[PDB]
């Protein structure tokens, strides 16, 4: 079954959402040329520890080393932050961060472009994001997560891209991953029916070329089978009565925190 979370938990995870997606736009100016991704790492948990005096949910989880994923270009997901690790001009990266506070987890990612930035690099970061945005859009209650997976897939091909199979968007709360489970492509398996007061992720990952990845002998990161680029950005979201609302929004989103159907 679906966790239907009460008005003083959805509080609960608005304050969590926020502090993840704090810890992004706190990052936004560290992630420069030459700079390391063990480095930004490190911050980033000073900062969730010192003072936002919370806990990140990355680290430990099943033996993860870091607090926090960062993902550039060819690999889709999972990396891990390495100070030996440098970012450079051109370089797409998405940073993936998830916050316990309260109890409650904020889950939140998005992609970031260093320096002088690439048209294709450029290009298949904005389509992830749409594909984001237009799977937000449809969140309200009655829809179907199948109508949502589809959609996303339908946009993303169409502009010559791939998703990822593999990985898929979540519930979340009390638990870092919950039901239900939000794939991002159409699926005779997907069959879940939106309630006000659910609380999930909707995470794309999108390949610029094909859609099979592979892990590495670290056991963590993942990159494209092909090593085309990968891109991913998340939100976690509360439905609501006539839509939804966005818990991680940040300054430089685009899209309306709370969205609503009704006339
Ligand atoms: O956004 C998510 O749901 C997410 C990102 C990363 C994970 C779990 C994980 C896998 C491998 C290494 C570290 C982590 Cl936190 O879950
Ligand atoms: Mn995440
Ligand atoms: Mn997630
Ligand atoms: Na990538």
Known sequence: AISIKTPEDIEKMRVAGRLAAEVLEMIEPYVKPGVSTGELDRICNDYIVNEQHAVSACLGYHG?????????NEVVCHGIPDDAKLLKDGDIVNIDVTVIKDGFHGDTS??????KPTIMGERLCR?????????????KPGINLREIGAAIQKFVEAEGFSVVREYCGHGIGRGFHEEPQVLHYDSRETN???KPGMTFTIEPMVN??????????????????????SAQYE???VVTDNGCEILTLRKDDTIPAIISHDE
Do not use: N
Not at 110 to 115: E, N, Q, S, T, Y
């Open 192 to 194: 879940v029916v939106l």
């Open 127 to 139: 389509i992830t994001q749409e594909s984001l945005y237009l799977a937000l859009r449809m969140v």
């Open 208 to 229: 610029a070329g094909k859609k099979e990845i592979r892990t590495m002998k670290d056991g963590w990161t993942v990159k494209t089978k092909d090593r085309s680029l």
């Open 64 to 72: 993860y080393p870091k607090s926090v994923c960062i993902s550039i």
């Open 110 to 115: 998005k992609m970031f472009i260093v320096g």
């Open 235 to 237: 939100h976690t979201i």
